Amino acid sequence: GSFTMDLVEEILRLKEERNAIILAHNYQLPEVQDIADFIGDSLELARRATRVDADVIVFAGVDFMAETAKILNPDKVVLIPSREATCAMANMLKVEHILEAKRKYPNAPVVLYVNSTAEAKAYADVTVTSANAVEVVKKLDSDVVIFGPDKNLAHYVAKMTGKKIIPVPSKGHCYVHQKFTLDDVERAKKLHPNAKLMIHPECIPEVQEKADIIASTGGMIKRACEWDEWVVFTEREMVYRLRKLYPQKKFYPAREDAFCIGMKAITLKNIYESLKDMKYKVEVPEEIARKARKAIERMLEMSK
Ligand code: SF4
Ligand SMILES: [Cl-]
Ligand SMILES: [Cl-]
Ligand SMILES: [N+]
Structure with a gap:
């Protein structure tokens, strides 16, 4: 040809x-x-x-x-x-924040979200993602941990482990997941009343509380077998991934406009x-x- x-x-x-x-x-x-x-x-x-x-x-x-x-x-x-493929949340955490927290709490393990610079990780005792943060923090030998950057994941970890979480920095968060509100929950359940809600722990706590499952994107995939219809409270390309993996199920974006520029x-x-x-x-x-x-x-x- x-x-x-x-x-x-x-x-x-x-x-x-x-x-x-x-x-x-x-x-x-x-x-x-x-x-x-x-x-x-x-x-x-x-x-x-x-x-x-x-x-x-x-x-x-x-x-x-x-x-x-x-x-x-x-x-x-x-x-x-592209060197402009970057995470806004990861760059909010600087070494100075970690050192100041370590001064206040020298016996607290430093637990860094993988959304962090390599320089920051050099000061971590252990890293976590949204898939394992609860398990890791539960196992650490301390009732208090230094944790960041994401304050919404920190809230989820504190709730699930009962441990005291010292945030670094003070206000770390993901702008993408902050787009989800209680109004999005109400709209999703009205438009898709038979769907369950899968919600990323980077969403704000009041939205997390409406979830059927709170999970990393990996956990969303692992647990999608638990129902046949889902509204997806994470970055909107996750809907494509779930539809490809499970063509027989129904997936709906919670917000089409939840996009990660990086x-x-x-x-x-x-x-x-x-x-x-x-x-x-x-x-x-x-x-x-x-x-x-x-x-x-x-x-x-x-x-x-
Ligand atoms: S969606 Fe993008 S900005 Fe938000 S935490 Fe994940 S990589 Fe970072
Ligand atoms: Cl390989
Ligand atoms: Cl299947
Ligand atoms: N111990």
């Missing part, structure tokens, strides 16, 4: 030529999810980064996720397709350019990476 390769076919060829794997988060654009080799939540992506056979990881996700992959694979090439910095074109030009190489200074790795490895040890 007269036709050549499209972007998809160019990516498939370059993935072979580079001996690469494409890891994608659940919030990636559908056409990006459709070319990824592995799709998952933050915890699943971290765990998958410990069994990489490929030489090159193309990370279709935000900065903190790609850096976590690099911390776990210091001697592989990790590429982020996630959508990743495009098919820049994934192609990432493989073609071997960019942008993610690097983490060795001293930071080794300390961060200790905290991430401990997380993986404490939650299977």
Whole structure:
């Protein structure tokens, strides 16, 4: 025929030529999810980064996720397709906040959400995601923990563990999940009265309290078998992921306008350019990476 390769076919060829794997988060654009080799939540992506056979990881996700992959694979090439694929919440936490909390509470473990810089993780005893924060905090040998950046996840963890949570920084939150309100709950239950509500713990507490399930995006997928219709209180591309996994169920976005700008910095074109030009190489200074790795490895040890 007269036709050549499209972007998809160019990516498939370059993935072979580079001996690469494409890891994608659940919030990636559908056409990006459709070319990824592995799709998952933050915890699943971290765990998958410990069994990489490929030489090159193309990370279709935000900065903190790609850096976590690099911390776990210091001697592989990790590429982020855009350096503007960033998490607003992760960048709210600075080392100075951690040091001030550690001064007040020297015996409190420092528990950092994976939404954090590698520099911040160098001061963590253990990392967590929304999938394992409760389990990890419950197991830590202290009735008080320093925890951040997300104050809404912190609220959920405090409620479920009964432990005292010292927030770092004071007001960390995700603007995407803050778009969900009680009015969205009322509208969803009116429009879809037979649906159950799956709600991310980055949503505000009063919205969390309306959930049928509170879960990470990975837990939403794991627990979707519990009902046939769901309203999805997280970033709207999760609806595509759930529909692909369970075509027989019904999924509805809680808000179509719940979009993560950083996630959508990743495009098919820049994934192609990432493989073609071997960019942008993610690097983490060795001293930071080794300390961060200790905290991430401990997380993986404490939650299977
Ligand atoms: S959805 Fe929110 S917390 Fe998750 S990557 Fe985007 S800004 Fe960060
Ligand atoms: Cl692999
Ligand atoms: Cl199924
Ligand atoms: N103890």
